């Protein structure tokens, strides 16, 4: 009386935690696309002089 419902619970937890597991696999093996970037700036710090080109 104690073994059958145990086995059924094992199967159900297996299927659910296993879909959870296969998707969490994709989450963990690649966590790079969920990252970000520094996005630096040059900002042209030279407001003391101008440029050589004809347009400037």
């Amino acid at each position: 009386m104690q073994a059958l419902l145990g086995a059924r619970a094992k199967e159900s937890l297996d299927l659910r935690a296993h879909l959870k597991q296969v998707k969490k696999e994709d989450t963990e093996k690649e966590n790079r696309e969920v990252g970000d970037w520094r996005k630096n700036i040059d900002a042209l710090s030279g407001m003391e002089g101008r440029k050589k080109k004809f347009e400037s």
């Binding site: 879909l19 994709d26 690649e30 696309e33 969920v34």
Partner: protein
């Protein structure tokens, strides 16, 4: 350059295109499904300026471009523009040439054959991909959700698919594919906002409306009570900032547009709506398979982010459904991205490595092979 030659994964919709590599939990980048072209005469020289722009380039430079979408209702009608998108998506942005990696693309199971065949053909003939496999979108939604049983209702920009799957099997006689989608909700909103005094007709205007929808709209689980107040008082209106500093407010129209998913007649469509198609996908299956589909309504794709859609999709089904029975909506955070995520999951399965079309079998059979090897 990569640690392993895993598949590149890319979900090409009528709205967005998303890609990354197999095994991760997110695409690296998202692009609109757009190829842009200048609609003006250039006057300054040495301004750079491309003859055509792709993806985010097309949207970023849109001020003088007309923007076209190569995909409509789930299929590619303009493969040349998709070729440009795939090059940009896979090589310019993920930095991987398909030549050295298998590629996993996606399509609905009742998606017209020419599209699954063309995707197979272009990746093999213009990108020289060593292998191909075009995934079933419903399957990927189930992989990302952690379900084998349920109705996958993917309400995306293109088409609503409505497919019942039980224990990993499709019940194809019960698929209610419906030509009602997020793209129509956007155009309906452009027209209803015109009625409010804010006309929208051009590409820039359509992109604004798509942005308004994505930030301001909702479904409302009880739209009659919601509109009784929203149509009567400004307290239910929400302001949106337009690119030029203008402000538009939207009241009951804010949910009336998404309401079209339940009320298709708003856009001239003859349909029962997404909740009845979910119902029929369940009801048209055998009785020992419906008791599991009722308890597993699987939400996927975009438009699923509208607040009230999950509760609105569960209430309507419950109303159509028999009593006693438990009706349940599954609406995970992996929404809109669930197909891409499922793609990553499918691509990394050890059992999936026997499902690939190689670039041998492809040339011997031609692109019609997709129906022999994929689905």
């Amino acid at each position: 350059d990569e640690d392993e030659t895993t598949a590149l994964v890319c979900d090409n919709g009528s709205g967005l295109v998303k890609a990354g590599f197999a095994g991760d939990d997110a695409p690296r980048a998202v692009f609109p499904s757009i190829v842009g072209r200048p609609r003006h005469q250039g006057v300054m020289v040495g301004m750079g300026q491309k003859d055509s722009y792709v993806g985010d380039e097309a949207q970023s430079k849109r001020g003088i471009l007309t923007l076209k979408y190569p995909i409509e209702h789930g299929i590619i009608t303009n493969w040349d523009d998709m070729e440009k998108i795939w090059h940009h998506t896979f090589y310019n942005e993920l930095r991987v040439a398909p030549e050295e990696h298998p590629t996993l693309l996606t399509e609905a199971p009742l998606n017209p054959k020419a599209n699954r065949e063309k995707m197979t053909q272009i990746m093999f003939e213009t990108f020289n991909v060593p292998a191909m496999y075009v995934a079933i979108q419903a399957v990927l939604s189930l992989y990302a959700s952690g379900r084998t049983t349920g109705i996958v209702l993917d309400s995306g920009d293109g088409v609503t698919h409505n497919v019942p799957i039980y224990e990993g099997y499709a019940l194809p006689h019960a698929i209610m594919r419906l030509d009602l989608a997020g793209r129509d909700l956007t155009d309906y909103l452009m027209k209803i906002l015109t009625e409010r005094g804010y006309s929208f007709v051009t590409t820039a205007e359509r992109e604004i409306v798509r942005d308004i929808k994505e930030k301001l709209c909702y479904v409302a689980l009880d739209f009659e009570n919601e509109m009784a107040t929203a149509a009567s008082s400004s307290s239910l209106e929400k302001s949106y900032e337009l690119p030029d500093g203008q402000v538009i407010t939207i009241g009951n129209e804010r949910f009336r547009c998404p309401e079209t998913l339940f009320q298709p007649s708003f856009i001239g469509m003859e349909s029962a709506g997404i909740h009845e198609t979910t119902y029929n996908s369940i009801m048209k299956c055998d009785i020992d398979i419906r008791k599991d589909l009722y308890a597993n309504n699987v939400m996927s794709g975009g438009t699923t982010m509208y607040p009230g859609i999950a509760d609105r999709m569960q209430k309507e089904i419950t109303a159509l459904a028999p009593s006693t029975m438990k009706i349940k909506i599954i609406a995970p955070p992996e929404r809109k991205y669930s197909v891409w995520i499922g793609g990553s999951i499918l691509a990394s399965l050890s059992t999936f490595q026997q499902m690939w079309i190689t670039k041998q079998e492809y040339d011997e059979a031609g692109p019609s092979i997709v129906h022999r090897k994929c689905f």
